[PDB]
Each structure stands twice: as C-alpha cells, then as structure tokens.
Design a protein around this ligand. Sequence first.
Ligand SMILES: Cc1cn([C@H]2C[C@H](O)[C@@H](CO)O2)c(=O)[nH]c1=O
Ligand SMILES: Cc1cn([C@H]2C[C@H](O)[C@@H](CO)O2)c(=O)[nH]c1=O
Lengths: 304, 300
Amino acid sequence: MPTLLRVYIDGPHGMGKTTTTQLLVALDIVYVPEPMTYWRVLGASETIANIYTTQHRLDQGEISAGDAAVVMTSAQITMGMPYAVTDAVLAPHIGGEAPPALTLIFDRHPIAALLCYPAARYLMGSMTPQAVLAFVALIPPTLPGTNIVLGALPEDRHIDRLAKRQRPGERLDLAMLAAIRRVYGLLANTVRYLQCGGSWREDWGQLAGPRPHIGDTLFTLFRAPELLAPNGDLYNVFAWALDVLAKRLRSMHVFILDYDQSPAGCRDALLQLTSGMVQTHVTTPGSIPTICDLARTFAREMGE
Amino acid sequence: MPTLLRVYIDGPHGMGKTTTTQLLDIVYVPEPMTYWRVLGASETIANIYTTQHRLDQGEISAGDAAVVMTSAQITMGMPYAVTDAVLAPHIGGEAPPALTLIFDRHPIAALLCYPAARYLMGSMTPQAVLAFVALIPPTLPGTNIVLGALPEDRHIDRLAKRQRPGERLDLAMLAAIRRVYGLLANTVRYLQCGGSWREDWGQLSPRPHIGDTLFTLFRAPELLAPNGDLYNVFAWALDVLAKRLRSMHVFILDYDQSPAGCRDALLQLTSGMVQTHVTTPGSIPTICDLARTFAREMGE
Ligand SMILES: Cc1cn([C@H]2C[C@H](O)[C@@H](CO)O2)c(=O)[nH]c1=O
Ligand SMILES: Cc1cn([C@H]2C[C@H](O)[C@@H](CO)O2)c(=O)[nH]c1=O
C-alpha cells in the first residue's frame, strides 16, 4: 500500500518557517500554507490586526481583561478553523504508521491555534486559563505519524527578525514574542516529559535527553487560582482537560530545527530531519490524489 | 468486556428534560450549572441572554454580540467536550448493559445547536458556527440522542416554569432553537436515507428536502464566493457535519405528558438504543466515577 509523510512546521512567528518550507517543497510533495485569506477575509475581517490591537488596547488600559478575552477567544477560534477542518477531513485517510508516495508539508498544526497561541495569550492576560483548557479539550485526536518540527532561534536574533517578518495588522510586541517562545519551549518539553514516562498527576505536587521537570512543561501554566478548588486541588474538569492534553501530545513525533542559519541552510537542515520521520499508509489507494487535491485546494483558496 | 448504554437527552430548553431524566447500574451526568455560573466564567447563562437583549435593543452591534456569544458557547460546551474526550478511549464497538449513562445534553448542543440558533438570532457569525462544527468530536459507537416533541404553546408554558438563573424568556430564541433541533432531526434522517448535500445543494438555489435540513442555514452570504459558490473551507465543514451526524441514533420523546409518563416513555425508547462494549475490564467503574464526579462538582 502507498505511504504518506506528514510534517507540520510550527513554532513562534518570525523565525522564517514559511520560507524554508516553501524552499523545501521547491525540491509528490505538497505545501499547506497558513490560511491568511481565511484570517483576513473569509472567516472574519483582519483577524491578525484584531488580535494585536486588542492586546494593545488592553495593555493601554483602554479595554478590560474581560473584553480582551471575549475578543481573543473569538479571534482564536477563527484562526484555528482551517486547521481543524483540514485535520477532520484528512483523518479518515490516515492509515497506520509504516520513499513516501506523497509528502504534505504543513504550515502549523492545529495545536498552534488551539493550544499555543491561546496559552501565550493567557500569559499575556488576554485570555482566561479556563478558555485555554476549553480549546485543549477540543484538540482533535492525534493522528498516527504526526511529525512536528518546532523552531529554535536565539531571542536577540528573533527580535531583529521579528521587526522584519511582521504581518498586516501585526504589532511588534516583545512581551508576546517571549510568551509564545516560552509556550513552544514548554511544548517541546511536555512531549519529551510524556514520552519519558512522566505523569502530570503523579508530579503535580512538584510545582532527546532526560525527562524534564513538570515545572518545565505546559502543565505548569495551569497552576492558576481560577482552576483551584477551595481545597487547593485542580477542579476535576480542569484535571480532565490536562489528561486530554497529555493524551494528544504523547503520540506526536517532535523535531527541532535550527533557524539561526540561511534560508537554504534551514531547508537542507529540514530536508535532513525529514528522514527520521514516521510515514503512514493511506486508507484507500485513491486517498493520495484526494489528499493531494485537498492540500492544493486549501492552498489555492486560503494561501496568501 | 461488559457493555454500556450511553443516552444523551437533548433538545430545546424548557421542555422538562432535566426533570424527567432525574425521575429515572445507571448514572446521570447532570447539566454543568456550576461550571457555567462559577467554574469557567461567572454567570454564563446570564451573559448570553443579556447580550442578545442589548443586541435586540440596539445597545450593541451584531459584531459585539457575536464575539460575546462565541466566547460564551466555548464556556457552555467545555464540560461536554472534556467528558467526551475522557470517555472516548473506553468506548468499544457496538453490540442487559453493565452501565447506563444518562447525559443531560450531547456536545453538539453547544458546538452546533445553540450556535446555529444564535446565528438565526443574528448574534453569531455562520463562520463561527462552522468553526464549532469543525471541532465536533468523532461520533463514538452507540451514541443515542433523545430529542423532544412538544407543541409550541405548551413549550412556552413549560419554558416559563423553569428558566435558569440569568435567563430571559425569549420567544424568538425558543423559536430559533426549536427550529434548529427540528432541522437536526431532519438532517439525520436525510443523511441516513443516503442524502448528499453536495449533490442536493442546487435545490436550495424517501427523504427530507435539503431545504428542511441543517444545510439550508449555511446558504449564508458570508460563506459564499462572489459567484455564489460556497468556499471549500465551509464545504469541508459541511462534510464533517454530515459525517458526525449520520452515525447518530436519534430517538424522539413526546414531552406533552406527565413527568412519570415522560419518564416511562424514555425508559421505553431504551430497547432500540445501541449499546457498545467498553475497552477494558475497569472501564465501567472508571466511567462510573467520572459520571459521579462530574455530577458532584458541576451539578449545582
Ligand atoms: C496560528 C496563529 C497565528 N497568530 C499570529 C502570529 C503571527 O502574528 C501571525 C501569523 O502566524 O498571527 C496568532 O495570533 N494566533 C494563531 O493562532
Ligand atoms: C447547552 C446550552 C444551553 N444554553 C441555554 C439554554 C437554557 O437557557 C440553559 C439550560 O439549557 O442554557 C445556551 O445558551 N447554550 C448552550 O450551549
């Protein structure tokens, strides 16, 4: 049966993720871009502009935390929509883990919009930890062969790039760059932690390579007073959401790519990471052209 | 492994659902009122009814209401979503049952039905509605949904009897919501009798007419390209909707009767509901403790 290789390139914005994936594809391989047209027009109007303005208004004291949250949560649902439909429509074609007959290079995974940016916004004070856990409860079941490439880039180098790689409506917010950089750092650790045998419930009280300390994983973000019962423990609803988070991330295959290099450098470095990656079979022989066409339609309609 | 029967009592509010289910080897996962009012946010139900009210009075714009409405529906469905998420792994294949779980509403209530009704009320974008649909969890085996039957004036009488803290009798929402659950029941029959929305979509320009299914709501101008074409993103979310709903097992309960009769009728529908196997020996006790803990923490 034919196999498929799926690779999601994720991480904080401003590292050169979209460039190098395109470079990679410029070499039976399809790119699924960020759905900017959905973000700027189809799902709502100028969602990215809406996000950075809200935070700024909040930061300026022009709106309250409750107003920012209402707006952020809503904006986050719009941001993740194309990721979620694509994942759900793709799911029945993914077979068991197995050159690839088709390689799909995605620009971000559903968790970017359902976990990472919400978690970072929570840290920024524009989202509640309860809403983040709601998003987490809705993260779609992790398909076999979910390979995630996260990016690394020194912060000073990132700050300079960030001034550069702005979006229309995006504002230079270093506090946010730091929050999102931290959130993704916690993400990589959580996967290792979970794969090294870590159980958040067993270590809750404590709040490649060896197993990380729970305090160096995403679980640590949820030590908020809002989620704690009068008896000091997490309410079970929130505890159950942490169970889903651990369940979703434990099966992902996470790789780190050094972006502190030239565009062709990142491309060849990614081209090299891509071999130790899990492929999977497809559910029907004709899943390949189907998948191929989904990606192309997605690209053609929402890419921009 | 032992067997389980999951039964989700759903439909518009104000029909007497919670009351008749309480009158029923069987656990009851109640309505998460504590989560709505305290745990996830403060007085979510009040927040919802008040926003619609300000919208209605022109005190706020449709976009302001949509942001609030969307944000709140996330708070409303959280308990259903995690429960489903944590439950999924124990549900085995379809097959007296070792355990009977009676849920007060299914995830689709907060991820499809209320959002759709709110769009019908002008307080939620259809793009938001389709984002929630896209997030509807895969439909596990043995998902039996009991929906209700009750004449409007009789429902109004009941609606009046029990409104949750913060509610405002809104006959236009009663109508929008009864419309949605009516279309829902029609959509399931449609999907089961072989209906293809992609194939029947043009008619909007033995089975229910697509114009009488949930698909008709998404012939919304915001979802269409300049030439009238539905954008693919939205068409794919309709594919998910079709996929999620088709495998559901729907049962209708006539509420136009007494609580014990409603209770009797419900227990009666049980004979045709689909049971499933659990995945582990220990699935039953674990499922039991979840349902009991949920009840304990979130039922007020
Ligand atoms: C995917 C995603 C991106 N973004 C921001 C990061 C960049 O500013 C820009 C494009 O990724 O949008 C969000 O704010 N939320 C999201 O969920
Ligand atoms: C389940 C649900 C209920 N409601 C309302 C209906 C009733 O007012 C109350 C209890 O069902 O909550 C919503 O507004 N949204 C939801 O998603």
